[PDB]
From Swiss-Prot:
Serine proteases that hydrolyze many proteins in addition to elastin. It comes from Sus scrofa. InterPro entries: Peptidase_S1_Elastase_sf, Peptidase_S1_PA, Peptidase_S1_PA_chymotrypsin, Peptidase_S1A, Trypsin_dom, TRYPSIN_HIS, TRYPSIN_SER. This is Chymotrypsin-like elastase family member 1. It is an enzyme of class 3 (hydrolase). The lineage of its organism: Eukaryota, Metazoa, Chordata, Craniata, Vertebrata. Its main location: secreted. The gene is CELA1.
Length: 240
């Protein structure tokens, strides 16, 4: 997250860290959202490599023991059947992960609230992006969970010429674009939390930023629109 601030330890309890095994060690690659005690929603492109992955819930500082984390392996990865690696601009950047074990819910580990199917937010709705991704374009990962206020840019404006044009589809949400705050590499897969009727719901799975950089004026961070996938999510979780 570029332009962010450190989140309080108990603010975003559905945020997870998706990590891969690197020799004898583990490294953070993406965020994700806990949606059942044994299912995590993340971006399909995060699990494109054939790596060994684990999920860390209750995580705050990637590099020190917080005393609140649970570490669990990944037993099954289900990516959307329509996901194309060579076209993130085509959409369907979403994947479900069932965990080898159910995690324990407490005030650092909670389920994310998903929107009702089809819900679209008003232009410039209040949302926060969270993650451990790069704190600058071509920078390095944050050690502590960051957050940043990222208001939505609706489909008509975000698919206009001056913003992303044709690169964005209506199965996506745009948020940000002020040139200061944004998602960045390592944030992919994580939540866009938006306040709707006094409740925060996870409306976006972070998908991509501009090839020019993370925080680029009029290139908002693009997210998979979770409310376009509610039937797919429920159908996967009911069958697996
Ligand atoms: Ca830690």
């Amino acid at each position: 997250v570029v332009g962010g601030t450190e989140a309080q330890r108990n603010s975003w309890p559905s945020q997870i860290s998706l990590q891969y095994r690197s020799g004898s060690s583990w490294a953070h690659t993406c965020g994700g959202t806990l949606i059942r005690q044994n299912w995590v929603m993340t971006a399909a492109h995060c699990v494109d490599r054939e790596l060994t992955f684990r999920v860390v819930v209750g995580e705050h500082n990637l590099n020190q023991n917080n005393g609140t984390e649970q570490y669990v392996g990944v037993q099954k990865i289900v990516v959307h059947p329509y996901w194309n690696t060579d076209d993130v601009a085509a959409g369907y950047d979403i994947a479900l992960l069932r965990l080898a074990q159910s995690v324990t819910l407490n005030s650092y580990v909670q389920l994310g609230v998903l929107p009702r199917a089809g819900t679209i937010l008003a232009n410039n709705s209040p949302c926060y992006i969270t993650g451990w991704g790069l704190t600058r374009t071509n920078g390095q990962l944050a050690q502590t969970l960051q957050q940043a206020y990222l208001p939505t840019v609706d489909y008509a404006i975000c698919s206009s010429s001056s913003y992303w044009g044709s690169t964005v589809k209506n199965s996506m949400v745009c948020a940000g674009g002020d040139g200061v705050r944004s998602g960045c590499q390592g944030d992919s897969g994580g939540p866009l939390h938006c306040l709707v009727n006094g409740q925060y719901a996870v409306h976006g799975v972070t998908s991509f930023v501009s090839r020019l950089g993370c925080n680029v004026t009029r290139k908002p961070t693009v997210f998979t629109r979770v409310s376009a996938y509610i039937s797919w999510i429920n159908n996967v979780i009911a069958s697996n």
